[PDB]
Amino acid sequence: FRQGNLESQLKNRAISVRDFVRGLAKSEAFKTLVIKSNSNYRLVELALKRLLGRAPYNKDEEIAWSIKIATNGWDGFVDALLDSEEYQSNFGENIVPYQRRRYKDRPFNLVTPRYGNYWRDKLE
Amino acid sequence: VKTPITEAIAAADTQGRFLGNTELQSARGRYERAAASLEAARGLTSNAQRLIDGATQAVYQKFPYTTQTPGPQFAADSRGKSKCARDVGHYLRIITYSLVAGGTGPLDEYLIAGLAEINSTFDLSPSWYVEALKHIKANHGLSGQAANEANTYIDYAINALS
Amino acid sequence: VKTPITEAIAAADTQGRFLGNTELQSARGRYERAAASLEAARGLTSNAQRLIDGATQAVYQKFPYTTQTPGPQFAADSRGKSKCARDVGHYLRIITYSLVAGGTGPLDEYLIAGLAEINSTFDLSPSWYVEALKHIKANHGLSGQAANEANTYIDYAINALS
Amino acid sequence: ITTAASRLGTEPFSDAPKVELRPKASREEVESVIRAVYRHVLGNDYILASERLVSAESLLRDGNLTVREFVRSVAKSELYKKKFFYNSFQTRLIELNYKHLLGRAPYDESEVVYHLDLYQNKGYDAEIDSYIDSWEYQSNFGDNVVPYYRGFETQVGQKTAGFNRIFRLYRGYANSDRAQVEGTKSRLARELASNKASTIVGPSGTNDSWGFRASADVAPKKNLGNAVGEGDRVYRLEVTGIRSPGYPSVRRSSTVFIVPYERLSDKIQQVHKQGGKIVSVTSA
Amino acid sequence: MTLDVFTKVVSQADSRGEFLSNEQLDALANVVKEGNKRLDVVNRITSNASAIVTNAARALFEEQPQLIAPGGNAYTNRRMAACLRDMEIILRYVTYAILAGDASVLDDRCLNGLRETYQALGTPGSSVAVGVQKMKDAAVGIANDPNGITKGDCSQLISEVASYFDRAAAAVG
Amino acid sequence: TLDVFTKVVSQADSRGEFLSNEQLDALANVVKEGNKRLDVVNRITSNASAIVTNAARALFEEQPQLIAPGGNAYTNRRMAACLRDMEIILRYVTYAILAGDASVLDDRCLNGLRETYQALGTPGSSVAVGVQKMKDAAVGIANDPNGITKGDCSQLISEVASYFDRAAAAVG
Amino acid sequence: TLDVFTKVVSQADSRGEFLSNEQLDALANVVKEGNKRLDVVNRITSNASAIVTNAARALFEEQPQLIAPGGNAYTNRRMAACLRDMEIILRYVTYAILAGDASVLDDRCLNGLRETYQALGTPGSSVAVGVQKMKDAAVGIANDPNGITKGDCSQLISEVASYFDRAAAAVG
Amino acid sequence: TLDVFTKVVSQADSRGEFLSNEQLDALANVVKEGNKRLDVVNRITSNASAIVTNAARALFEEQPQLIAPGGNAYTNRRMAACLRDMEIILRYVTYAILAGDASVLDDRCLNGLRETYQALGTPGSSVAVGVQKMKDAAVGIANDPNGITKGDCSQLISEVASYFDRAAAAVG
Numbered sequence A: 001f002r003q004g005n006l007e008s009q010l011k012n013r014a015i016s017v018r019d020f021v022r023g024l025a026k027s028e029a030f031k032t033l034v035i036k037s038n039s040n041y042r043l044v045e046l047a048l049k050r051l052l053g054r055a056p057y058n059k060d061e062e063i064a065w066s067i068k069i070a071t072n073g074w075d076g077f078v079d080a081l082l083d084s085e086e087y088q089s090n091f092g093e094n095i096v097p098y099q100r101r102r103y104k105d106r107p108f109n110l111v112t113p114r115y116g117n118y119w120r121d122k123l124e
Numbered sequence B, C: 001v002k003t004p005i006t007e008a009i010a011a012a013d014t015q016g017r018f019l020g021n022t023e024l025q026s027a028r029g030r031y032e033r034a035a036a037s038l039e040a041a042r043g044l045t046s047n048a049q050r051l052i053d054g055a056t057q058a059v060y061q062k063f064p065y066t067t068q069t070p071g072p073q074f075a076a077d078s079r080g081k082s083k084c085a086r087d088v089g090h091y092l093r094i095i096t097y098s099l100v101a102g103g104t105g106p107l108d109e110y111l112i113a114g115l116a117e118i119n120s121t122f123d124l125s126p127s128w129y130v131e132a133l134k135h136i137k138a139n140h141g142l143s144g145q146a147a148n149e150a151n152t153y154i155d156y157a158i159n160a161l162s
Numbered sequence D: 001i002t003t004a005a006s007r008l009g010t011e012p013f014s015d016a017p018k019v020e021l022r023p024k025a026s027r028e029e030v031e032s033v034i035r036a037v038y039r040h041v042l043g044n045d046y047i048l049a050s051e052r053l054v055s056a057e058s059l060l061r062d063g064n065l066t067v068r069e070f071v072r073s074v075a076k077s078e079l080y081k082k083k084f085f086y087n088s089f090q091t092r093l094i095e096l097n098y099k100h101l102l103g104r105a106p107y108d109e110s111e112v113v114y115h116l117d118l119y120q121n122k123g124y125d126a127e128i129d130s131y132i133d134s135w136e137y138q139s140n141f142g143d144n145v146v147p148y149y150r151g152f153e154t155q156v157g158q159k160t161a162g163f164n165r166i167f168r169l170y171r172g173y174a175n176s177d178r179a180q181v182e183g184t185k186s187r188l189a190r191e192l193a194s195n196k197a198s199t200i201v202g203p204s205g206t207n208d209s210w211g212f213r214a215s216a217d218v219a220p221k222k223n224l225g226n227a228v229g230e231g232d233r234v235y236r237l238e239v240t241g242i243r244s245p246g247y248p249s250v251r252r253s254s255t256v257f258i259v260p261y262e263r264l265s266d267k268i269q270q271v272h273k274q275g276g277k278i279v280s281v282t283s284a
Numbered sequence E: 001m002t003l004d005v006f007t008k009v010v011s012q013a014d015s016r017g018e019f020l021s022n023e024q025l026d027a028l029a030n031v032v033k034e035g036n037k038r039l040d041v042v043n044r045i046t047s048n049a050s051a052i053v054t055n056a057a058r059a060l061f062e063e064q065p066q067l068i069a070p071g072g073n074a075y076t077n078r079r080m081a082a083c084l085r086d087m088e089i090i091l092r093y094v095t096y097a098i099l100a101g102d103a104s105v106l107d108d109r110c111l112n113g114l115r116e117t118y119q120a121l122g123t124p125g126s127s128v129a130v131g132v133q134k135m136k137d138a139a140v141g142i143a144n145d146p147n148g149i150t151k152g153d154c155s156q157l158i159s160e161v162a163s164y165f166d167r168a169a170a171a172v173g
Numbered sequence F, G, H: 001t002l003d004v005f006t007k008v009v010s011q012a013d014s015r016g017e018f019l020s021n022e023q024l025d026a027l028a029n030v031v032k033e034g035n036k037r038l039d040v041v042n043r044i045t046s047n048a049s050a051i052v053t054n055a056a057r058a059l060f061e062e063q064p065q066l067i068a069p070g071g072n073a074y075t076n077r078r079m080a081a082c083l084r085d086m087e088i089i090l091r092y093v094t095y096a097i098l099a100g101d102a103s104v105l106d107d108r109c110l111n112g113l114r115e116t117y118q119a120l121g122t123p124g125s126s127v128a129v130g131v132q133k134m135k136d137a138a139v140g141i142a143n144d145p146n147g148i149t150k151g152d153c154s155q156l157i158s159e160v161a162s163y164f165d166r167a168a169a170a171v172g
């Protein structure tokens, strides 16, 4: 799954780490693993949970980000998330994604499965 | 810096749109307010030597140990008292700055940013300047609505100290 | 650029001294010269369409081969004659520039620097524009002291062509 | 150079008359030649009256002395060493003597190598003799003509990498060259052997941000990555001074960004929000 | 950085470290009196914002026809739109500076890299200056004429607007 | 080095058209106010050295720490550096008054003064106070009528107060 | 300043071994094509000034805004900067053709051209177009046989088209 | 981030041979002086905040213009920038003392400090003086024996005086 070209760029330093995460989110090796198996509202939640490193606030905001993804594509919704003012101020320009505050909160990798409860029912 | 003119500007910049009537009404709220605030600044600049003499002597009578205790931080020596009138002489500039600018910009950029950061290091108790400003709050001699506008900035500095 | 005001400035700069009476007298020589030179510029700007029509037709009758010989450099095609009125239309601007500036600054900076450099490459004979300016020298229509002032810059351009 | 000379501050050098020394003696022209020597050689530092070298001057009045022998004698004088030679590195000086005695910034590093083995074997007083007795000095400066800056025009045979090392040398007419914030260290000793040519930064007010030096470990100028952007146009924008949110957010001001095309328009809007100023974007 | 006329005096008086002098407060009291004329001029531009973008565009693309001609820098419909969209961005940052009364907001956003960004882009700087100079004689002319309003001479205030476009023009071309 | 005239020339060169009539009407007014421009420039250089020393004493009183030891202008040499320099503001200001344009002021005396001080350690305030103490005395020297014919030059003196304010605000 | 020969020398110096046999076999081929290299280099400098003016007219037609006022190559002084500097590409290209290596082209005419334009305001794209108009005419001048013996120069002319493409793509 | 051990490791990796006997004899001495290294590092971080304030007062007395308006450290916000920073020298110095190598000091606190100031306007001398006022007090804190066993560490304390002198001379 790992990309050779992207890894080389970081060492060179040509691409900012924030520009580097765009490679992994718009990677079709990543896209087959998560977009075939997950619905649109789960695609909001997984992108907030990993890239922004935050839990979603409510249900009504995964609905809010949903319209943009269908029209702008998966790349266009990721592009709007990474160029959000909230992402650029708090992570800053060159700092790897992480969870901001977890005083007593589940790790998100453990908390959220790569795929959804819907796609499991097709497998049965 | 923060000014309710530039507060209207920087808000319209992030949306990427022209100055509508939303940002425009924030301007004349600053404009009219200056006529009750500029002679609020004239009441302080004319009484400059009174208040820094008054607040410095008010600190010593409130805290009598600060003239006796040996230390650089205190006002036992002469250069402490020379640094005494420098500090409260520096407070009255920014209050006259933030009254003339009409916002809490110069109070943010020049006084209270890192003000709680330095006082932990040099063990300057902030309650010293609380009683210093409270003497200026009662003895600035200003009257009317203009005085009230001027006063908020004294109380805005006190809440930043605490 | 060169102006007898700035000629007085740049001379006093290298010596590192103030504007004495040596540099000061160079200013009023420029000032009262302008009153015989500004209406010398008004005589050319009012007659703008006359002279560029007159000098272009004067070139063709002086050199009859330049309308017939096939080449980009010549005026056989239409875009040659379109570039004809552009060139002499560009000369009359700088003469009105250098009359208004009162010095040979704009003639130096905008026309004659590298003028003998390009004409070797594009095989534009300078004797073409010599006869072009000599028609303007005789048909400008300017008279009196002002005319004399407009007459030198025409002759200063001719000696730069040759 | 005109309308770039206003910005870079090189309009006074662009139309600067040669002083010369016509062989008839006159005190005023000699007085104005002497200011033209000490302004260029000492980098617009001031000379006080004990600093005047009045005994240097007596020889100058006589016919035998030639501005060329005078310029040898000001640089060998201990006054000139007190400002430049003692408070500086030896490579900086080899770089510096080309700025004063020759007028151009050093072209190759190999020119520099020759000087060190000359400086060791024959001393510094014979090094300055080798700057003056050069064919490039005699070709453009006569015996009676002051050295001026030749960095700007073509001076055929120059490399253009040396066109931009001259703008790293002096920051305007107004500057001392002891008064640049890297004053003691050689600004071009890294550039001469990396053999890259850094970005021209102009002086203050005409350019809104003068505060850009090339870093140690900075982003490469030409890059390979597509950088997420759908169309390959990639541009390399550097910022000069960033005073945006503190201790973890900005660990390093003046960092060079490499941003592709389609997010360049939002990128300039983020940098200005940070309060930073842009000295250069460059296609690569 | 975003500065006012007021914070211009503040940051200048901060560097000397003295109190605000009396004539500076006398000068700023005059800015209060001309404050209502400043809202007269700024409101008139943004009402005629889109009308002056299209009108200055036609006068530009007539008098330089090679731009929308093929091979030109503004030929295709995309670049064209960007150029068209941009001409608001001069006016966005000019009318910020008129309402601010200072050229600090104009300098670090719309002036700090425009003469920078064009060498890598191939856009012509001189042409752009002309485009902005075609805005200036129409933006002054829109705010000049009086219809259904009190008549006063701010000529000392309109010259600030003509200075702001001339600051925006000469920094690029 | 630009004039008021070559300001109009280089501006009319960029548009590539002839000089318009009102521009020649405006420049004809500069001819009429040309003799008042020599009135103001001659009055400064006659009082040049008197206004350097007088602005120096008012500076070094009101900031006493400069000539005090440890200060930036303490020793005799640097002190002459500052003293010699205060003419160089006035050298390039009265160039700009006689030019009528701020182009000569900008690329010589303004282009690197705020640059050169970070490497030098000279404080910003000292320069600003020093030039702003020249301005109220240079305007006051050219204001008073004694043995000259009375005229009006308030539209011209404001150019001089703008030139010092251009020189002051570009540094501090 | 490197050759094809000193390219192999400095490469064989880094490994520190003797020169291998096939490297001498390859350099013996450069001796055989050495007379064709003087055929191509002599043909360019004979047509040097004719190809500067001819590529200039095709540039300044197809971008008319340059000569036009406000353009970067408007006035007669800058215009000579551009017109005569088109030789300097050709000066350093025909050095590299006779050298057979792009080292002389890189550190003189390529090392700071994309550098020097941001400070100058000369458009990068315009310069690239001009050199690419030289390339199709410089190849076409050396291609045609008139009064020379017929040979094959396809593998050598492609080096010349590579040299202009190296000079073009490093700027624009 | 390198040690004294990984200094020898990465040096022995480049030659590609086994670790020699005297290198293991030298590193065995670093084990014996290892407990004195924890004596010196623990004494600085216990007196960390006391030596920041004490070196700050001696700096801002002897350069009073920083404190004075117009200075680079005038306002309370910048003042905390400088004050907060003086720990960051000490944060990366005591890293290098416990590491025994100057590699961690070089690529974090030394690699861009002389870089970042030209864009910032912070003077070089102020930074250099402050670091050098830390050094004579940091050595003096670790020198005196009070309630510790007496030993000899002059060959180890000179490493600490070298680390501040490395930090000082790379900026000013």
Ligand SMILES: *[C@H](C)[C@H]1/C(=C/c2[nH]c(/C=C3N=C(/C=C4\NC(=O)C(CC)=C4C)C(C)=C\3CCC(=O)O)c(CCC(=O)O)c2C)NC(=O)[C@@H]1C
Pocket (backbone or CB within 6 Å): A040, A063, A064, A065, A066, A067, A068, A070
């Ligand atoms: C249409 C016949 C009826 C209708 C449509 C309508 N919907 C909305 C708001 C939303 N629609 C969606 C739909 C989708 N999101 C998806 O990701 C996909 C699959 C790719 C679909 C079909 C969502 C998420 C919303 C929420 C907001 C959004 O646009 O992003 C509106 C707007 C309503 C509002 O803004 O409150 C409308 C008009 N509604 C009707 O009236 C018709 C009966």
Ligand SMILES: *[C@H](C)[C@H]1/C(=C/c2[nH]c(/C=C3N=C(/C=C4\NC(=O)C(CC)=C4C)C(C)=C\3CCC(=O)O)c(CCC(=O)O)c2C)NC(=O)[C@@H]1C
Pocket (backbone or CB within 6 Å): D242, D243, D245, D246, D247, D250, D251, D252, D253, H066, H072, H073, H077, H078, H079, H081, H082, H083, H085, H086, H088, H108, H109, H110, H113, H116, H120, H122, H123, H125, H126, H127, H130
């Ligand atoms: C202190 C003796 C002098 C001084 C310092 C000063 N620094 C700043 C601001 C910054 N300092 C740094 C330093 C670093 N960041 C790093 O990552 C490293 C490597 C470990 C260092 C050394 C940075 C990045 C900044 C940015 C601003 C910030 O605080 O976030 C200031 C403030 C400048 C301003 O404009 O606010 C100051 C004053 N100044 C003096 O006068 C002292 C002599």
Ligand SMILES: *[C@H](C)[C@H]1/C(=C/c2[nH]c(/C=C3N=C(/C=C4\NC(=O)C(CC)=C4C)C(C)=C\3CCC(=O)O)c(CCC(=O)O)c2C)NC(=O)[C@@H]1C
Pocket (backbone or CB within 6 Å): D261, D262, D264, D265, D266, D268, D269, E067, E073, E074, E079, E080, E082, E083, E084, E086, E087, E089, E090, E109, E110, E114, E121, E123, E124, E125, E127, E128, E129, E131
């Ligand atoms: C129009 C008068 C002139 C012109 C313009 C032109 N611009 C572009 C491309 C861009 N312009 C910008 C400009 C800005 N970004 C900012 O943040 C600000 C300050 C608010 C400004 C003014 C940017 C970012 C781009 C590129 C990407 C993008 O716009 O999103 C082009 C495109 C050229 C091309 O080949 O792509 C053109 C043509 N063109 C002219 O000829 C006029 C003189």
Ligand SMILES: CCC1=C(C)/C(=C/C2=NC(=C\c3[nH]c(/C=C4\NC(=O)[C@H](C)[C@H]4CC)c(C)c3CCC(=O)O)/C(CCC(=O)O)=C2C)NC1=O
Pocket (backbone or CB within 6 Å): B056, B059, B066, B072, B073, B074, B075, B076, B079, B080, B081, B083, B084, B085, B086, B087, B088, B090, B091, B110, B111, B118, B122, B124, B128, H057, H060, H067, H074, H075, H076, H077, H079
């Ligand atoms: C512009 C806004 C502004 C203010 C007000 C300010 C205050 C300030 N006062 C300080 C010290 C001081 N402050 C005081 C003042 C006092 N101590 C006493 O004993 C009295 C109770 C009291 C006065 C009433 C003294 C005596 C010092 C020196 C203490 C020392 O050197 O340790 C210091 C640390 C050292 C310095 O640079 O001088 C700051 C930063 N700084 C700012 O930027």
Ligand SMILES: CCC1=C(C)/C(=C/C2=NC(=C\c3[nH]c(/C=C4\NC(=O)[C@H](C)[C@H]4CC)c(C)c3CCC(=O)O)/C(CCC(=O)O)=C2C)NC1=O
Pocket (backbone or CB within 6 Å): C056, C059, C066, C072, C073, C074, C075, C076, C079, C080, C081, C083, C084, C085, C086, C087, C088, C090, C091, C110, C111, C118, C122, C124, C128, G057, G060, G067, G074, G075, G076, G077, G079
């Ligand atoms: C701003 C001052 C200024 C002027 C005036 C100027 C003139 C000028 N005219 C030129 C060519 C030309 N000049 C002309 C003009 C003429 N040829 C004729 O046949 C007619 C007799 C005559 C006009 C009356 C023509 C037709 C060309 C094109 C010739 C060619 O392409 O070879 C050229 C070379 C190519 C160019 O860029 O277009 C210059 C530099 N340049 C300047 O910078």
Ligand SMILES: CCC1=C(C)/C(=C/C2=NC(=C\c3[nH]c(/C=C4\NC(=O)[C@H](C)[C@H]4CC)c(C)c3CCC(=O)O)/C(CCC(=O)O)=C2C)NC1=O
Pocket (backbone or CB within 6 Å): D044, D045, D046, D047, D173, D174, D175, D176, D179, F066, F072, F073, F078, F079, F081, F082, F083, F085, F086, F088, F089, F092, F108, F109, F113, F116, F120, F122, F123, F125, F126, F127, F130
């Ligand atoms: C006409 C264009 C022009 C300017 C403007 C100029 C300024 C100028 N001021 C300088 C120095 C200086 N400038 C000052 C000025 C001051 N220091 C203070 O603390 C005071 C507040 C202030 C005087 C009021 C001082 C003191 C120095 C000497 C610094 C030193 O010797 O360390 C230097 C460095 C060279 C030298 O000092 O010999 C230059 C170039 N030079 C020029 O050619």
Ligand SMILES: CCC1=C(C)/C(=C/C2=NC(=C\c3[nH]c(/C=C4\NC(=O)[C@H](C)[C@H]4CC)c(C)c3CCC(=O)O)/C(CCC(=O)O)=C2C)NC1=O
Pocket (backbone or CB within 6 Å): B024, B025, B028, E036, E037, E039, E040, E041, E043, E143, E144, E145, E146, E147, E149, E150, E151, E152, E153, E154
């Ligand atoms: C054609 C040249 C010209 C202009 C520009 C002009 C403007 C102008 N605006 C005025 C008033 C005014 N203008 C405004 C405008 C506003 N206040 C706000 O807070 C709003 C945001 C904004 C409208 C969007 C207001 C509130 C007044 C108060 C006086 C009045 O009603 O006229 C007046 C009244 C007389 C005076 O001010 O001396 C003048 C002169 N008069 C002229 O002759």
Ligand SMILES: CCC1=C(C)/C(=C/C2=NC(=C\c3[nH]c(/C=C4\NC(=O)[C@H](C)[C@H]4CC)c(C)c3CCC(=O)O)/C(CCC(=O)O)=C2C)NC1=O
Pocket (backbone or CB within 6 Å): C024, C025, C028, F035, F036, F038, F039, F040, F042, F142, F143, F144, F145, F148, F149, F150, F151, F152, F153
């Ligand atoms: C205090 C404010 C003030 C100024 C500045 C002032 C100047 C002034 N200079 C004048 C005349 C003049 N001023 C000059 C000055 C000179 N001509 C040269 O060519 C020399 C280089 C230079 C002297 C060095 C001359 C020659 C005149 C002619 C008229 C006269 O003799 O007064 C006049 C006569 C009346 C008028 O011009 O309307 C005025 C008003 N009057 C004022 O009320």
Ligand SMILES: CCC1=C(C)/C(=C/C2=NC(=C\c3[nH]c(/C=C4\NC(=O)[C@H](C)[C@H]4CC)c(C)c3CCC(=O)O)/C(CCC(=O)O)=C2C)NC1=O
Pocket (backbone or CB within 6 Å): D001, D152, D153, D154, D158, D159, D160, D163, G066, G072, G073, G077, G078, G079, G080, G081, G082, G083, G085, G088, G108, G109, G110, G113, G116, G120, G122, G123, G124, G125, G126, G127, G128, G130
């Ligand atoms: C869009 C097409 C285009 C090109 C290519 C162009 C080139 C051009 N290069 C110029 C100058 C220059 N050209 C160079 C370039 C060089 N000199 C050297 O020493 C090196 C050998 C060589 C680079 C490899 C330099 C250094 C200058 C400045 C020379 C001067 O100012 O006198 C000038 C005159 C001044 C100017 O505006 O900057 C033009 C017009 N103009 C154009 O419109």
Ligand SMILES: CCC1=C(C)/C(=C/C2=NC(=C\c3[nH]c(/C=C4\NC(=O)[C@H](C)[C@H]4CC)c(C)c3CCC(=O)O)/C(CCC(=O)O)=C2C)NC1=O
Pocket (backbone or CB within 6 Å): G032, G035, G036, G038, G039, G040, G042, G142, G143, G144, G145, G148, G149, G150, G151, G152, G153, G157
């Ligand atoms: C430095 C002075 C000098 C020159 C100029 C020179 C050229 C030169 N070119 C030659 C051959 C040649 N030159 C060419 C060149 C070409 N044929 C084509 O059709 C292509 C378009 C073109 C290359 C692009 C060819 C094909 C030959 C055939 C003979 C050979 O391979 O050398 C030869 C072989 C010997 C001879 O002709 O007598 C000479 C002398 N020799 C010299 O001493």
Ligand SMILES: CCC1=C(C)/C(=C/C2=NC(=C\c3[nH]c(/C=C4\NC(=O)[C@H](C)[C@H]4CC)c(C)c3CCC(=O)O)/C(CCC(=O)O)=C2C)NC1=O
Pocket (backbone or CB within 6 Å): H035, H036, H038, H039, H040, H042, H142, H143, H144, H145, H148, H149, H150, H151, H152, H153
């Ligand atoms: C003033 C110059 C000076 C220094 C610096 C000094 C230090 C010093 N620390 C020692 C011991 C020691 N020092 C430590 C310190 C520590 N071990 C840990 O694991 C902890 C993390 C850390 C404390 C936080 C320990 C554990 C010993 C063991 C021996 C003893 O108790 O003294 C000894 C015992 C004698 C010897 O080592 O030869 C010396 C000399 N003696 C001197 O004369």
